[PDB]
């Protein structure tokens, strides 16, 4: 237990084991026009993050796996060269070139998965 953002410089795998500690300080704490505008702004970012979470089919879960594969043109590095080798900050810095494409592919994959389940449940 390191606290909020404790594993900032740690490896990605080490920070992955403590995800609740960062999730519980996104809308709570201690939070006149300035003060109220930030709260309304803050809640929109949480709903921005939760709406994308639900549209991919990861509603209410901190670790969810998908159906899309990994494209090598995004990044050629290996698993042991990521989880025990890099921090989340530099990872987000390097992969910040194709995030929108990945988000769109996740959206469409979850949509087709929902359509497939609706087709299958008709027997």
């Amino acid at each position, epitope marked *: 237990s390191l606290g909020f953002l404790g594993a900032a410089g740690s*490896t990605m*795998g*080490a920070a992955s084991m403590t995800l609740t500690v960062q999730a519980r300080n996104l809308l709570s704490g201690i939070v006149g026009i300035k003060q109220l505008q930030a709260r309304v702004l803050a809640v929109e970012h949480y709903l921005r993050d939760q709406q994308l979470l639900g549209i991919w089919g990861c509603s209410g879960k901190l670790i969810c796996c998908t159906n899309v594969p990994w494209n090598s043109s995004w990044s050629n590095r290996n698993l*042991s*060269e990521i989880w*025990d*080798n890099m*921090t989340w*900050l*530099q990872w987000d*810095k390097e992969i910040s070139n194709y995030t929108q494409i990945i988000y769109g592919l996740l959206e469409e994959s979850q949509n087709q998965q929902e359509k497939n389940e609706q087709d299958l449940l008709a027997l």
Partner: nanobody
Amino acid sequence: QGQLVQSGATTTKPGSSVKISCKTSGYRFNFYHINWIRQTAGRGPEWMGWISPYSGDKNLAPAFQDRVNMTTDTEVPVTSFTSTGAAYMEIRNLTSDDTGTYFCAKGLLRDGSSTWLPYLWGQGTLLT
């Protein structure tokens, strides 16, 4: 990426103690261990020892237990993930039998079962 540059190729007669520098660039100098390995002509490649430029915890071979001295200074952060550091190494009871080419190599990872493994090597220096 990352690159490591070594000292000059100077020679000295037995009985002395020489220091070899190793300057790092292009990576977090604190995130990986550093190893020193010597290639001798009349012997095989010998792992001498590694130190941690983050914890300062050292571990050498028993053959170099009381004869080799290895130190580092603090890093200079270039960016959030790039740093520049240095590493120095000396031998106390030095003779002419330890002649060879010395290499400084940064560690492989910062976690796992192959952390300190010498991964990224230097240019090599020629001794007496």
